[PDB]
Design a protein around this ligand. Structure first.
Ligand SMILES: CC(C)C[C@H](NC(=O)[C@@H](O)[C@H](N)Cc1ccccc1)C(=O)O
Ligand SMILES: CC(C)C[C@H](NC(=O)[C@@H](O)[C@H](N)Cc1ccccc1)C(=O)O
Ligand SMILES: CC(C)C[C@H](NC(=O)[C@@H](O)[C@H](N)Cc1ccccc1)C(=O)O
Ligand SMILES: [Mg+2]
Ligand SMILES: [Mg+2]
Ligand SMILES: [Mg+2]
Ligand SMILES: [Zn+2]
Ligand SMILES: [Zn+2]
Ligand SMILES: [Zn+2]
Lengths: 518, 516, 518
């Protein structure tokens, strides 16, 4: 419970914003066949031109205003093109003689937008919202989108529009004002209406994970992160328990505890549970790596390219799992019981730290020879997986910023999924599709298992000879699931948006769609 | 033949090649295990497992036709030994006729389905005995369960691992066997795999010979000479394009790479055509860099492995190895073009430079960001050449990106492509050849990193570290409207532990051509 | 016996040590070859060579007391096999009593005197025949010439390589049975019999050192390692004193204390004494470097190739000295008093650690400017050498994993010896010859002395200019011995068997032969 401090100025909680400005936006959806009213604020058309690379803009909607309809005639629009992510603003007086702003974002010439294309559209729309004090946005869909992509549009709009100012003090943006109303016109509106508040929920799970990830290691440490998790559980009425060191010692969690030895913050293992009222048909454990700062330990992140300054993000797994708890707790699916687990700790340099070469004993009795203190995530996950399997679940899914090698294999757009069960992997791939968080299935190559044979311990933490480190880490984790369907999502390459200098909150919507689909 | 230039008169002017190998003299017989075993002669090895009982005892069930060997094989003696994968024992003894025989076993663990990796460990253990034996016959008794493809793989791997390459040396511990007996259940169905294995073995071994051949022996001229000689022996159509023809074709990307080399570029084009109607045309394109120094981007960083870079023509060797198999097995209804833009990547006053803008044969200008990304430059022009042939499929195979070691490692190659059906055919070939491959994505979001400020395209990304995916995006720019796949064998081509090539890809490509 | 401090309750509080090993249960019988060999149960291996003829044929020359086995081993049958060094074959047949027997040979090549390295190769071949074969007995027939020392070395090596250290195995023990009996046939057997128990003692001292070296730094820390030394003294009836920090401060051991400042484990200085019951004619101090983990300190081992993961091995000098104590205490030489010393500590990174640049005062009052916290071994040895000279001994010999440069100079096979006294160096070289643990004499080059001149302190810990780091270390140590014959053995290159992934226990037999032959 109490966060230790070195000096009185050290923070004792993570600041967390629950009621965000996005939550105050009144959203209305209307059917496009009634025509568009253009009365105030900004009205943006989403337009493409199938076939025609950089083709002309042609506004097809009925617009219920003579002045605006006149402005938007093909002749007047012909100067402009649909190049993806392109946009323009128009200014005019409507029939009520009130000035309005109108514009468009180009959605290109391929009639089915990828998740990345749609994100490009949303970013252009967001630049129209920034540096312009507007009370209302209206979006007219003149493109084709399924229900999941419409929801993705809104989630992405909400998340990209929201600006995280929790750590601003003298430099808050004096000009940021958020719209209070969002109008949407789309064909077959009634079927899209359900997606609006689901988007709002998914936006918040994602933005909540993001807040946790962006919070630096002096704010977000094992104690404050587990305290935040308790507060979340209380707000959603989830069952919760936080296991402290004495309980962890009783459970013989020697791999997890060795990692956190050198830290000033005691280890805290988070265990939240959602249980549907009614028959429980699937039981699922979701396990998130929760290293609140990864210095590397005695194998210090000192090599060029090791990104030590980014390592507050090494609890992104735990944050995805807590974001997922927010969504599941809010949407209340039937027929399931979900355990949201994270072994939280910090990997530090101290007289008290574990050392390279140390032999430690995991909670399932396996001895492990530590070959590199910087492979700490798999040690904490090892004990968390053992704990998960004891719960008697149908599926165990872990999510973790586990290996830097992901940047060289899949890069920054797709997460890797590994697993011991093809049906579970397919469920995750399915969830990747409907969440629009991209994942690619990678193999657990058993030929490399022999490189984890230790001369002294039961197993080596790291390979001597294999450089395929994401596969080797999956081989190691596999040793801590005995007989349960298990998949492991490595988000090391996708978690942080290096270009925008912010978290993605990657995996919240993926894991939630996984729970919901099941 | 073109003459190979020499700096001194001691410089070699051809690659030595062994066509006739001791493996070719092995008479192979397959017998049904249901009849019991004849152990009267030579070295007999039982392949044995113990399901469930991990590292459990050896127990041999087969009846054998010798009372002395029966005694040796009794449960009480055999239980002194265990089945741990690759563990072996063998003993010399006298049979009923007082003739020297030897008898032993290789442990096959306690899992009934052996993977190709597992089967490799079994074979290595068998080969260790063979490299220290001298008896005229080996008999292998399968008391384990393998499918037809895995049985073929066993044979191929046995032949390949048993054969030792002594071309560059100037045992009194062994002699090559003249006979191989195999006892296995349903022997009749397995018999047809034998000569197929012997063909796949030599395709693989031939590729290996070319890869292991050092870069003073195997240069663009001697390698293309070797391909002409292979084509002649197989009756394939062949054409070697030299520098003047290559300039006429405007192959600026490929020619730029070889500018620094004393050896003129040579583009190998062999063709197999079926005697009956052609229903399918395929181009197989192999990366053919006979030595990759890196160029001005010299391989000087720790772990860059410049000492290994004679292996950078592994894709070319795999294609030529495939041409041996195809030219030998003679598939019907197919026309296959075997292609390689061969050159050497060197440091010279004459070399291309980082920064150069060069023009590929399809008109695209390319800004060179790194002279050690030379493979994709030579493949760009080879791909444009392939597409102009009007084929149904283009498959390229190349030691293209060091990043493979960090994504899939040393066991599985990666495949990328623009066509799902073709990728699935490659995956299926991978399953039947037992040369493992994994599908990796061409991620279009990374394509913008290849937008050059000056040229039509960048050779490399400044930002994206997913270099195998970026390389594939680059190559995809050189295939306009044909099903195409790219196999990156950088991680998988060289066997680091054994200090020798794998010949990776021969069987994969041959299976592709034969079964599709 | 001090309490081992723990960070968590799962931290181990002692080093596990096996004293009664399966090798100790083996009954050894030596027979003279003139009586013929009896060939019965187990496995009977002939060691055969063929002088002149590289890879020449096997010919078995011993009389075998069995007609069937004699027929089997006749020249005609054996000539199809060759003597290539390390090569081996197994034979199966029925003896004259109709009982199946296993026989075989190991090739010993064509050179009539085997080097220590060649013999190791023969033994490794023999061990592979023992492994994965449930045998009650092994019989070895020598048809090669070995002197008494080489015979003993054969047995020591056999025992050492055969013994498998499973102390840290839990779930992965080798489901491994040992022979109960070892028969040896050799010419002039009566003359070799005395080597058998000597070999068995030397095996254990070596294996004991090996157990200490392989024990990871969480098990083997300065408190637990000094407790193990106490236990060993109690078992052997050696005197002992363990000096703790209060006594070390009183003795002004500032160099040694500074190295340990960063550790959570208090320094412990080990002092064991063996004294012969008769008139003492020689007094000897053996000093071993005792760093239980070397992180480098603030000069962290982060450089590629710094092998931080192997640094549990930095107490290998101390282990060799304690292995020597075992042998000496067991064999009980006369007319000698031996002091076994080690300044044990751990070199860590902490708010409390010593710093690059710190100036510290050794117990002989010399001030030392610290140039690199990773040159910590010579600082601990400085103080241990001052203590040792105060004892009033005739010879001081230290042994230490002191400099990585040994790998570039002598490599992994030979240790280097440096000293201030040629008579003593020659004694060490003679011990090397009779122990078969190779050492080469290296110079202390006075010309480099000047590069240890400190602008501020009395001396520099390290050279800024000279890259010959092993010689520089020796020069520095020389300054802490005023008037006594001293030698220094640098075992950094030789201690760890990199290929086999285990210690050699190097130095035990060398130091024991030194003591015995004096
Ligand atoms: C020691 C290695 C085998 C494993 C090591 N893994 C780690 O450091 C993880 O604990 C890192 N948190 C993973 C990471 C590294 C760089 C960027 C993003 C994420 C890695 O270097 O990838
Ligand atoms: C600059 C990069 C995008 C590409 C570069 N590619 C190359 O060097 C190729 O020409 C190499 N032939 C690929 C290679 C590297 C290391 C081991 C085996 C194979 C590489 O370093 O992987
Ligand atoms: C700073 C240098 C002059 C001295 C430094 N010495 C050390 O690090 C010792 O404390 C090390 N124990 C030496 C070592 C390194 C690698 C393998 C075996 C032994 C060394 O690098 O050898
Ligand atoms: Mg790490
Ligand atoms: Mg290159
Ligand atoms: Mg050091
Ligand atoms: Zn981490
Ligand atoms: Zn290359
Ligand atoms: Zn040291």
């Amino acid at each position: 419970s109490e966060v230790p401090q070195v000096v009185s100025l050290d923070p004792t909680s993570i600041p967390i914003e629950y009621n965000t400005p996005i939550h105050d936006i009144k959203v209305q959806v209307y059917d496009i066949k009634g025509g568009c009213n253009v009365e105030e604020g900004l009205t943006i058309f989403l337009v493409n031109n199938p076939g025609k690379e950089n083709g002309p803009v042609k506004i097809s909607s009925k617009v219920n205003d003579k002045q605006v309809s006149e402005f938007l005639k093909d002749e007047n629009m012909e100067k402009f093109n649909v190049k993806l992510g392109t946009s323009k603003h128009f200014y005019m007086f409507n029939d009520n003689k009130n000035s309005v702003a109108v514009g468009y974002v180009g959605c290109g010439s391929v009639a089915d937008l990828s998740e990345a294309d749609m994100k490009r559209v949303v970013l252009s729309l967001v630049t129209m919202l920034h540096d312009n004090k507007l009370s209302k946005l209206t979006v007219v869909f003149e493109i084709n989108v399924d229900k999941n992509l419409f929801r993705f549009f809104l989630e992405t709009l909400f998340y990209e529009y929201m600006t995280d100012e929790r750590f601003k003090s003298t430099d808050k943006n004096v000009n940021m004002e958020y719209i209070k109303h969002l109008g949407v016109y789309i064909n077959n509106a009634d079927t899209y209406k359900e997606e609006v508040e689901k988007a709002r929920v998914y936006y918040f799970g994602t933005y909540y994970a993001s807040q946790l990830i962006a919070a630096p290691s002096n704010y977000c440490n094992p104690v404050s992160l587990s305290n935040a998790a308790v507060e979340l559980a209380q707000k959603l009425n989830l069952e919760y328990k936080i296991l402290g060191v004495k309980e962890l010692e009783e459970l013989k969690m020697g791999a997890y505890l060795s990692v956190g030895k050198g830290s000033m913050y005691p280890n805290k293992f988070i265990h939240l549970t959602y249980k549907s009222k009614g028959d429980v048909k699937k039981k699922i454990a979701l396990v998130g790596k929760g290293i609140t700062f990864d210095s590397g330990g005695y194998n210090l992140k000192a090599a060029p390219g090791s990104m030590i300054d980014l390592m507050k993000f090494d609890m992104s797994g735990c944050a995805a799992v807590l974001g997922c708890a927010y969504c599941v707790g809010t949407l209340k699916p039937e027929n399931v019981e979900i355990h949201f687990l994270s072994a939280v700790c910090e990997n530090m340099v101290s007289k008290n730290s574990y050392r390279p070469g140390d032999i430690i004993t995991a909670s399932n009795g396996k001895t492990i020879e530590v070959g590199n203190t910087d492979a700490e995530g798999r040690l904490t996950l090892a004990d968390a997986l053992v704990y998960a399997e004891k719960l008697g679940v149908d599926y165990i899914v872990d999510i973790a910023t586990l290996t830097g090698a992901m940047l060289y294999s899949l890069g920054t757009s797709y997460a890797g999924v590994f697993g011991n069960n093809e049906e579970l992997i397919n469920k995750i791939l399915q969830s990747s599709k409907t969440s629009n968080e991209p994942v690619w299935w990678l193999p657990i190559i058993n030929e490399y298992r022999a490189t984890l044979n230790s001369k002294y311990a039961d197993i080596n933490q790291i390979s001597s000879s294999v450089k395929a480190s994401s596969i080797v880490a999956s081989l190691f984790l596999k040793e801590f699931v005995q007989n349960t369907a298990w998949a492991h999502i490595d988000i090391a390459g996708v978690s942080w948006n290096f270009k925008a200098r912010k978290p993605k909150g990657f995996g919240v919507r993926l894991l939630t769609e996984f729970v919901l689909n099941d």
